[PDB]
Amino acid sequence: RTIVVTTILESPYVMYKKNHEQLEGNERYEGYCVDLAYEIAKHVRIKYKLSIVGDGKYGARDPETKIWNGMVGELVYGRADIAVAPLTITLVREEVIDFSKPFMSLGISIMIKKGTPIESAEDLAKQTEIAYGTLDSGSTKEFFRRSKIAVYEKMWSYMKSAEPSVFTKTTADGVARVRKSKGKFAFLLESTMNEYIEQRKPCDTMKVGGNLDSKGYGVATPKGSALGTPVNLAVLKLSEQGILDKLKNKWWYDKGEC
């Protein structure tokens, strides 16, 4: 009866509450997706348990083993019933799991340490003094790997062979690297994460230029799952009732600091 909700520790979607070590189950976490899961469960009328994905990855298929990892994998192999996280709706994922309509709209963006002489993707691509990377094994890395647009093809060419590696295991590592590189490192991440970090102390980063693409995050369920329909309708109702807007403001700006 209790459905398993796989998710990921990514701020401000899912974070450990101040005194998580003193708590258990769902009470250990807080964040946009923790609230979203609560609201969805309320409309779908289900009991659930949040589960942080073991490998801490979003989801990608190994070209060799063909095995899916991350949250996508938890769904594909039946270990999770639903995924409530900033999981990007992509073609390859849509082929193996189901997605609700978007609960958040975003695009790939550029994060720089304030003062960095960069204003666009073209600016990064035409130079090598400033290094740049992305989260490893996510939709952003795939974007550059698959792009047929000149400027992005140039960027992938650089990152693909960059040494040391410019692909971080977590968004947090990417941000830390930007903050510690004195402006010699820029990070490619989704606007949502970018906008959030920009509102947090030391307030030393900022999003520059427009987004590289336009897409969205969706709540995922195993392909053909009976929860897909109810979850989709729940997402649309939350959207139309302004709750998604309320949650975004709550976790991004109301708790602003810059």
Ligand X SMILES: N[C@@H](CCC(=O)O)C(=O)O
Binding residues: 86, 88, 93, 139-140, 190
Residue type at 74 in one-letter notation: E
Shortest distance, position 88 Cβ to ligand X, whole Å:
4
Shortest distance, position 25 Cβ to ligand X, whole Å:
25
Instruction: Tell me whether residue 48 or residue 58 sits nearer to ligand X (CB atom).
Output: 58
Strand partners, 67: none
DSSP percent split of the chain into helix, strand, coil, nearest 5: 40, 20, 40
Instruction: Tell me whether residue 189 or residue 247 sits nearer to ligand X (CB atom).
Output: 189
Coil/strand/helix, residue 32 = helix
Instruction: Quote the tokens at residue 233.
Output: 């309708």
Instruction: Tell me whether residue 54 or residue 117 sits nearer to ligand X (CB atom).
Output: 54
Shortest distance, position 189 Cβ to ligand X, whole Å:
5
Biggest CA–CA distance in the chain, Å, is 55
How far apart CA 110 and CA 32 sit, in angstroms, is 22
How many distinct helices (H) and strands (E) make up the chain? 10, 14
The dihedral sign for the CA sequence 39, 20, 84, 49 = negative
Shortest distance, position 58 Cβ to ligand X, whole Å:
4
The dihedral sign for the CA sequence 46, 51, 52, 58 = negative
User: Kindly report the CA angle at 43 between 33 and 245, in degrees rounded to 5?
Assistant: 45
Q: Which residues are annotated as part of the binding site for L-glutamate?
A: 86, 88, 93, 139-140, 190
Shortest distance, position 136 Cβ to ligand X, whole Å:
9
Applying CB under 6 A, the residues found at the interface with ligand X are 58, 86-88, 135, 138-140, 189-190
Shortest distance, position 99 Cβ to ligand X, whole Å:
11
How far apart CA 173 and CA 63 sit, in angstroms, is 25
- Residue 2 to residues 25, 75, 95, 224: CA-CA distances in angstroms? 12, 15, 27, 19
Instruction: Tell me whether residue 135 or residue 219 sits nearer to ligand X (CB atom).
Output: 135
Instruction: Tell me whether residue 58 or residue 132 sits nearer to ligand X (CB atom).
Output: 58
Instruction: Tell me whether residue 214 or residue 241 sits nearer to ligand X (CB atom).
Output: 214
